[PDB]
What does this fold into?
Amino acid sequence: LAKRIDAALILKDGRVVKGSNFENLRDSGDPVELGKFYSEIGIDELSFWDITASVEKRKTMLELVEKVAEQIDIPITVGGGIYDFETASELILRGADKVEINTAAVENPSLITQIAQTFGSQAVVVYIAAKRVDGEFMVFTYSGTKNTGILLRDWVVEVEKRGAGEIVLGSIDRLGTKSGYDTEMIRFVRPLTTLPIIAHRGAGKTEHFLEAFLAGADAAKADSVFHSREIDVRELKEYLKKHGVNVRLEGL
Amino acid sequence: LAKRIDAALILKDGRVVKGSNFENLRDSGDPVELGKFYSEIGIDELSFWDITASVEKRKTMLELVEKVAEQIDIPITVGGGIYDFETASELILRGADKVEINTAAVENPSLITQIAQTFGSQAVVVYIAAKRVDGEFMVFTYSGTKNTGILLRDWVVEVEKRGAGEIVLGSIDRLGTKSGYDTEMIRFVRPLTTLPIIAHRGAGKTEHFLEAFLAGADAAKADSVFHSREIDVRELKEYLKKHGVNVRLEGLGSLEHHHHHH
It folds into this structure.
């Protein structure tokens, strides 16, 4: 089974938040240059996650996408406060391959279907932020701060039913940690959906990616661990290929 | 708290009295099919009101409660022939989430407390039918025909004391009409109770719902205006959300898909 390695860039005001340690780049915190550089060294897909809280949010995300679409030739996902079909449509028409939704999907699951009905399920990504609460995995919205009371197991099933193309499974229990992906969470979700599962949060070293794929993840997404160069993308892919993981190195 | 939209279905011998205008249904007068359909287009809670007379048929209604409970994944309230704890108790054990009482409560207020102690206050709904009489809000029993002489103010307060979970506030002054909920009555009752208030009678158009919620209603119940499709449920929820009301959209579009059947 083919496995995907994704890099995610957190953005604010058109800049990579907390930047990156790639001194070779003209601008360590330029999302476009960093994204191009990742696409050239072996990343399979890019996520651009906006946390801009300004009145300029829509215009900027749209500006960024159009620029990114020029320079970058691997799949692009945009996410972060995308709340309705018209916003999602604008971003896709401007060049995003996939749009990622979360809080708006949870509150209005019809939105998944609206996007999928026009652009295809493959254009739709649902980010599910989950956390253990009193012995059960629960869904959290608004940047991980609202306990919805919705069970992870129920929401995964509804997400597929509504027409989502893939699920990013972010463990709030691994937020900021470097101990490993939440493989218990990934194993919990795996039998519940036929969609691709993208693991997010907890990655600290190359072996963690192997564990995530053994747990049934189809893809593994990371951010700071890459930007900080704690893990080198090419080294990661060589490692995974060495131990029998079907990763794409057939690049050039 | 999200403002709530309830649909009430009036039943006679297992049939929806006067049916519905949803021709997509195989049987627009089947309460199970209609109830399930409402739950999959945006209704938040359902009430089933049985007006079947015979003792012989209060077993048939029980079997119906089981089947709607199993089939429908939103809260179910049942009312109609409840006159004691036993009948109330059985409906809940059959799968009703809540029981709704009116005349039975007024003619025995301890019945409220009885149900509550066994099943929690949340399973107890008191329907209050009221009407202006000489510039006073008075309580009516027996389908709004009998003036009990009890002030709405006093009855609202007793009903909460006895341990009801919520109050449905039905305006007899508004029955048959489509000129709106009795927002004056709703405003009258709001400061008197901490319980959820469900508005009933008078709704004719979507804006009437907005008015009720501005009046302090926690929920709005309607029947004929939904069954006739004078008001579309999804359109109602979208209108309320548009003008800033906190309503639940999770149930919207549950029947729709991302493919294209021609």
Q: What stands out?
A: The CA atoms of residues 51 and 121 of chain B lie 25 Å apart. Chain B has one domain: 1-262. Residues 60-71 of chain B form the longest helix (12 residues).
